[PDB]
Amino acid sequence: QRAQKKGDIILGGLFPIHFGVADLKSRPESVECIRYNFRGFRWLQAMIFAIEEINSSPALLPNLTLGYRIFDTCNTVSKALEATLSFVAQNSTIAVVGATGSGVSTAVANLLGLFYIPQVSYASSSRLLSNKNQFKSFLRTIPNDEHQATAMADIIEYFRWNWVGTIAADDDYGRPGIEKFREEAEERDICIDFSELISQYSDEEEIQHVVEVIQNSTAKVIVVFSSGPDLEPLIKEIVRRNITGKIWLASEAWASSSLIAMPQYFHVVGGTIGFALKAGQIPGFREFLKKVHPRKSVHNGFAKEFWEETFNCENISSVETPYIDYTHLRISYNVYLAVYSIAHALQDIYTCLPGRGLFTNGSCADIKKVEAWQVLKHLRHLNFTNNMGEQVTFDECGDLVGNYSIINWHLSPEDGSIVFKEVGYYNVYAKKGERLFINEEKILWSGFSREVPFSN
Amino acid sequence: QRAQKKGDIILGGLFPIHFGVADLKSRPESVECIRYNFRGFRWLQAMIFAIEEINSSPALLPNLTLGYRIFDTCNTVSKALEATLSFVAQNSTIAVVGATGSGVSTAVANLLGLFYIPQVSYASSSRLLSNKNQFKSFLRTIPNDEHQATAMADIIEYFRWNWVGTIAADDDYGRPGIEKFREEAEERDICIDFSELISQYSDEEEIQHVVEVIQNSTAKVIVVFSSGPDLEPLIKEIVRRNITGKIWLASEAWASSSLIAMPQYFHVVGGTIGFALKAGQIPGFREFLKKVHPRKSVHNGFAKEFWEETFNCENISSVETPYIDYTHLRISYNVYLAVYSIAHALQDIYTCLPGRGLFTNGSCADIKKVEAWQVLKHLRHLNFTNNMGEQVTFDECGDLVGNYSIINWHLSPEDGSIVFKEVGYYNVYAKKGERLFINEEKILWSGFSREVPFSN
């Protein structure tokens, strides 16, 4: 299954269409995914949507079509790596949209970097990815977790808390991020009661042990740096243990994750203050999402599966699912800018006056035979503006930043569903000590109480 | 340059023959190594030595020759990855000796795992490599750093110290290891004055900052988890800063590293207590090392370089160098067992009675057409004995353990060189609290003083 389309310029794509895959008595026989990832399918959608829009856009890259080769990482390096090999078979993909996971992106960046194939991630936020010495051809349209780690400490200090816990996934997006927060704390005089590591495949024993350490601890505030899949197993047992009254500080990855944000668990996950990326605006994207259908599209071979999953195999709106059930496009917007950033780099090459080329002898690149390294060069020196009206320009470490959005989980009496209410903002562009804004109101501590909890 | 030799069974090899490699105005043009790694060349030597010995060994694998395909990782994933691709071009290498670096091995294990190619590392000691969920085809002949992290804490508690520092390389062999030690401390009531991260390519500013944090701190004991190259830059400035009286606790990687262990720095690096792996015994290896010569051997294309480096381009003994200047073979012995472990696995396949096969239907594998996954199966269930007289059998996470050797750096008045005197032992096979033995004598605190230093 691969969303593929013919084009003069081919752009690779790696998306988590699923959440994870299922001795050697025989051939390994590969492995199969076992959990469809709605929203993740809406991701590749944006990518394809942006490609179509730019093809229909005469101003951007005229007399030139752009094709795409998009696969499924399924939150597994193995499937992601097999794909990355398929991308560098000739070395042709001029660029590949980075994967979402920090660990998955790390591995793909290793191979892609060897051939200097520009990789623009849309979710990877691991500080380790900023090592251009190893990740030379890595670029990310999402802020690193260094800023996030700082914001959490600010919030804990803001509510006068000195006794807190810690739970991070045993992988790139968590262990490194927590390290930064640990350093953020202690300096602000915030003692850490306990530190725990969880995984999507933690043994039931491990889960029991971490739940045991969650209890016992007198700390009521517990910071959590983990994606939805890794924290899914832990929260499940916490729910049956019915451990309530523990306030959780989400970490973006699971701040808007439906995997954890479900009414059946609101008893414990209720009132979880987390961090969301600034909501972007992709116009005409809603209609594109509704115009999906098997037999139709054809290129997006991923539709069949989607349809089977959304219709137990008919209007998409008929069946509720995170695919079209969205209020703010955040990571989806990141993907849109990611493909647009490459589009502008290619357009720059298409429009480079001789003697004004960033290449040697001020020479330009023949887009008729553009090379990936040439795109990387331009991508490094990219300074265009966003559709939202915002100058976009990757930094020296190929990273662009943006303010966060403090969010608090609240229950809606209309449908009993979990509505995420913005409660404050964190201005990254601001100065230190004047970057955090949290309206004390709109904060339902522990899902209901409106009195700041005690955590000393 | 590749040490290659024809054989029915081909075993890959990745060794750090060097210590590291040297915009996009033009094609990247690859990169070149810039520091020969003596001892590292002595490593591949052992590998080749073991291959020859087993070929000349009729009992082990009769009527069967074994060829090798060995390259240079040069402490760089990029060169290492390019090699790993060369190994899986057909997928043929039945097995590849793992690299030395934790980060380099991690990446190679990703690709090798995809094709289930058994990888047996000889130095990689990163706990993260024990994640068989990701590293399914990873096996290591060296203990993880979890045991080491425990030993350090024991030593600090043994000498009644509560105020200590921390300096780890910003990579797999350091950041994860220190995390374990941090947890080891605090529990033993050992406060950490400061924690710093260093790299082989840390900016001079970074070096100045870490040296500044090294000073100021009242902590006299400073634990250091880093390989020789990463700590080389920091120690250089500490020497010019002439910061003396600071006791250092080596971490195996640099406990016997000539890069740091040099008389010109004994003023600061003097009296550094570190951890060394149990010394193994490879018989007849000395003569093999002396029988090296360009024009001769031919297969080891790495000789030319070696010769140029050892003779500024003649008897090898004439020129002193860590290649033949060795008193205890440790990692070299690890490589010997690594290739022997594969040899025994292949011999098991060569001798499997029908109906007694670890494969389905109790079927054996046709060694005439042996597959890598079949070798992996056998490697998992390997239980042979060492030449030193020791049963060798990888654990569930493909890791074998061994007692460590507390070492203290001492100056020899005969040549003014830095002699490493064994001072104690750490029995991993022993119980908790009864595994650490450090003779208080033979300990020259700060290189000279014989009075336990004060670090509160």
Coordinates of N, CA and C in Angstrom, one line a residue, chain A residues 23-25 27-28 78 81 85 110 114 116 127 134 170-171 179 182-183 195 197 359-360 371 373 377 380, chain B residues 23-25 27-28 78 81 85 110 114 116 127 134 170-171 179 182-183 195 197 359-360 371 373 377 380:
Chain A
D23 N 9.7 -17.0 17.7 CA 11.1 -17.4 17.5 C 11.5 -17.4 16.0
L24 N 12.5 -18.2 15.6 CA 12.9 -18.2 14.2 C 12.7 -19.6 13.7
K25 N 11.7 -20.4 14.2 CA 11.4 -21.7 13.7 C 11.3 -21.7 12.2
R27 N 11.2 -18.7 8.4 CA 11.5 -17.4 7.9 C 10.7 -16.3 8.7
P28 N 11.3 -15.2 9.0 CA 10.6 -14.2 9.8 C 9.2 -13.9 9.3
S78 N 11.4 -0.5 11.5 CA 11.6 -1.6 10.5 C 10.9 -1.2 9.2
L81 N 12.3 1.9 7.8 CA 13.7 1.7 7.2 C 13.5 1.1 5.8
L85 N 15.0 2.7 2.4 CA 15.8 2.0 1.4 C 15.2 2.2 0.0
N110 N 19.7 9.0 9.6 CA 21.0 8.3 9.4 C 21.2 8.0 7.9
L114 N 23.3 10.1 4.6 CA 24.5 9.6 3.9 C 24.4 10.0 2.4
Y116 N 22.7 12.8 1.5 CA 22.3 14.2 1.6 C 20.9 14.4 1.0
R127 N 15.6 16.8 20.8 CA 16.8 17.7 20.7 C 18.0 17.0 20.0
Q134 N 25.8 14.8 12.8 CA 25.3 13.5 12.4 C 24.1 13.7 11.5
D170 N 10.5 5.1 27.1 CA 11.9 4.7 27.0 C 12.4 4.8 25.5
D171 N 12.5 6.1 25.0 CA 12.9 6.3 23.6 C 13.3 7.8 23.5
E179 N 15.3 14.8 30.7 CA 16.7 15.2 31.2 C 16.7 16.8 31.2
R182 N 14.4 17.9 34.1 CA 15.1 17.7 35.4 C 16.0 18.9 35.6
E183 N 16.9 19.2 34.7 CA 17.8 20.4 34.8 C 17.0 21.6 35.0
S195 N 11.1 9.1 39.3 CA 11.2 9.2 37.8 C 11.0 7.8 37.3
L197 N 10.1 5.1 33.7 CA 10.1 5.0 32.2 C 9.1 4.0 31.7
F359 N 25.4 28.4 -5.3 CA 26.4 27.3 -5.6 C 27.7 28.0 -6.0
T360 N 28.7 27.3 -6.3 CA 30.1 27.9 -6.7 C 30.0 28.8 -7.9
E371 N 19.4 18.1 -8.2 CA 19.9 17.1 -7.3 C 19.5 17.3 -5.9
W373 N 21.0 17.3 -3.0 CA 22.0 18.1 -2.2 C 21.7 19.6 -2.6
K377 N 20.8 22.5 0.0 CA 21.5 23.9 0.1 C 20.4 25.0 0.2
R380 N 18.4 25.1 3.4 CA 19.1 25.7 4.5 C 18.9 27.3 4.4
Chain B
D23 N 30.1 23.6 3.2 CA 28.7 23.8 2.7 C 28.4 22.8 1.6
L24 N 27.5 23.1 0.7 CA 27.2 22.1 -0.4 C 27.5 22.9 -1.7
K25 N 28.4 23.8 -1.7 CA 28.8 24.5 -3.0 C 29.1 23.6 -4.1
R27 N 29.4 18.8 -5.0 CA 29.0 17.4 -4.5 C 29.7 17.2 -3.1
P28 N 29.1 16.5 -2.2 CA 29.7 16.3 -0.8 C 31.2 15.7 -1.0
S78 N 28.4 7.2 9.4 CA 28.3 7.3 7.9 C 29.1 6.2 7.2
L81 N 27.7 2.9 8.1 CA 26.4 2.6 7.4 C 26.7 2.1 6.0
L85 N 25.4 -1.4 4.4 CA 24.7 -1.6 3.1 C 25.4 -2.6 2.2
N110 N 20.0 -1.5 13.6 CA 18.7 -1.2 12.9 C 18.6 -2.0 11.5
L114 N 16.7 -5.8 10.3 CA 15.6 -5.9 9.3 C 15.8 -7.2 8.5
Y116 N 17.5 -9.7 9.8 CA 17.9 -10.8 10.8 C 19.3 -11.3 10.6
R127 N 23.0 0.1 27.4 CA 21.8 -0.7 27.9 C 20.7 -0.6 26.8
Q134 N 13.5 -3.9 19.3 CA 14.1 -3.2 18.2 C 15.3 -3.9 17.7
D170 N 27.9 13.2 24.8 CA 26.6 13.4 24.4 C 26.2 12.3 23.3
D171 N 26.1 11.1 23.7 CA 25.8 9.9 22.8 C 25.4 8.7 23.6
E179 N 22.6 8.2 33.5 CA 21.3 8.1 34.1 C 21.2 7.0 35.1
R182 N 23.2 8.1 38.2 CA 22.4 9.1 38.9 C 21.4 8.3 39.9
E183 N 20.7 7.4 39.3 CA 19.7 6.6 40.1 C 20.5 5.8 41.1
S195 N 26.4 18.2 36.5 CA 26.4 17.2 35.5 C 26.7 17.9 34.1
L197 N 27.9 17.5 29.8 CA 28.0 16.6 28.6 C 29.1 17.1 27.6
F359 N 14.9 -26.0 14.8 CA 13.9 -25.5 13.8 C 12.6 -26.3 13.8
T360 N 11.7 -26.0 13.0 CA 10.3 -26.7 13.1 C 10.5 -28.2 12.7
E371 N 21.3 -20.1 6.3 CA 20.8 -18.7 6.2 C 21.1 -18.0 7.5
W373 N 19.4 -16.1 9.5 CA 18.4 -16.2 10.6 C 18.6 -17.5 11.3
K377 N 19.2 -18.0 15.2 CA 18.5 -19.0 16.1 C 19.6 -19.8 17.0
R380 N 21.3 -17.7 19.6 CA 20.5 -17.5 20.8 C 20.7 -18.7 21.8

